[PDB]
Amino acid sequence: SVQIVYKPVDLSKVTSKCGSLGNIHHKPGGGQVEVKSEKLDFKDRVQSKIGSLDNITHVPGGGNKKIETHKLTFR
Amino acid sequence: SVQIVYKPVDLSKVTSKCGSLGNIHHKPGGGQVEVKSEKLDFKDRVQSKIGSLDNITHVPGGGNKKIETHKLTFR
Amino acid sequence: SVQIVYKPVDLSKVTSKCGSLGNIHHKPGGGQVEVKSEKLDFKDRVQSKIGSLDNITHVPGGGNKKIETHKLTFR
Amino acid sequence: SVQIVYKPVDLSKVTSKCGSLGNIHHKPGGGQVEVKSEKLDFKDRVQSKIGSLDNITHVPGGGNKKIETHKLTFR
Amino acid sequence: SVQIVYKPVDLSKVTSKCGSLGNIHHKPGGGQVEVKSEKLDFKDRVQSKIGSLDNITHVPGGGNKKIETHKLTFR
Amino acid sequence: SVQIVYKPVDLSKVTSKCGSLGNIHHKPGGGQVEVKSEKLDFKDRVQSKIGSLDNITHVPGGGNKKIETHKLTFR
């Protein structure tokens, strides 16, 4: 016969302390953007993005990550 | 025969402390954007984005993440 | 017969302290951008980005990451 | 005695020809402009301009200038 | 006695010809502009200009200049 | 007695010819501009200019200049 005991344990801690957070600035695309196009031929699919796109400012007062996995397998 | 005891345990903790949060600025796309197009031929599908799109400001007072998985498998 | 005991333990800690966080600046694409195009032939898919795209400012008041995995297998 | 005869003459001509005039662009101040001030003391007059001021576009189909003077003087 | 005779002449011509004029571009201040000031003391007059100012685009289809002066002076 | 005769003559011609004029670009101040100041004392007048000022684009389709003077003087 076979007997299996599986009891792993976690009690872990993650933390931050800050006296103050501030005076934070992000200014993507401050300059002029220009595009000019003539006589182009396209014979297959086209995708275009122009200007100030997808820019992120991300200022979490704290932000932390855990990942865990368990896979007990018989045959 | 086969007998299995599977009782994993987690008590883990996540935190932040901030005395004050403020004076945070995001100003994407401050400059002029311009596009001019002449005599283009397209013979298949087109997508276009122009200007200030999809920009994000994300300022959570705290924001944290856990992922966990268990996959106990017999045959 | 076979008997298996699997009971690892974690009590770990991760931390940060800051007296104050501030006066932080990010300014990508401060200069002028220009593109000019004539008489191009495309016989293939086309993908284009112009300007200030995807810039990230990421200012976590504290930020930490941990990953764990367990794989106990019989045959 | 004294006698004076003063009979100057001008018959001069000024001209332009243009077959067509067009596609003229002026774009002053295409980028973002920013000013920040703290704890300034002024004990006399202040004058200030900020932004896009006094810019000129001047496209006369023709534009020409003549100046003339006559100063006939006795004693 | 004294006699003075003053009878100068001008018959002159000034000209331009152009078959076409165009595709002219001026873009002063395409980039971002920034100013920051702290704790400044002024005890006399102040003048300030910031940004894109006084810029000129001048495209006369023809433009020409004549100046003339006559100064007959007795004693 | 005294007699004075002043009778000069001018017949001049001045010209330009162009088959076509175009594709002219002027782009001053394409890059980012920045100024930072702390704890300055002024006991005297101040004048300041920052950014893209006084830039000229000057494209006369034809452009010509002439100056003349006549000065007849007695004693």
Residue numbers in the entry:
A (entry chain B), B (entry chain D), C (entry chain F), D (entry chain C), E (entry chain A), F (entry chain E): 305 to 379
Report text from the authors:
Residues 297–391 (using the numbering of the longest human brain tau isoform) constitute the proteolytically stable core of paired helical filaments (PHFs) from the brains of individuals with Alzheimer’s disease. Here we use time-resolved cryogenic electron microscopy to study the in vitro assembly of recombinant truncated tau (amino acid residues 297–391) into paired helical filaments of Alzheimer’s disease or into filaments of chronic traumatic encephalopathy. At the end of both assembly reactions, most intermediate amyloids disappear and filaments with the same ordered cores as those from human brains remain.
The first reaction was carried out in the presence of magnesium chloride for forming PHFs, whereas the second contained sodium chloride for forming CTE filaments. The use of sodium chloride instead of magnesium chloride leads to the formation of filaments with ordered cores that are identical to those extracted from the brains of individuals with chronic traumatic encephalopathy (CTE).
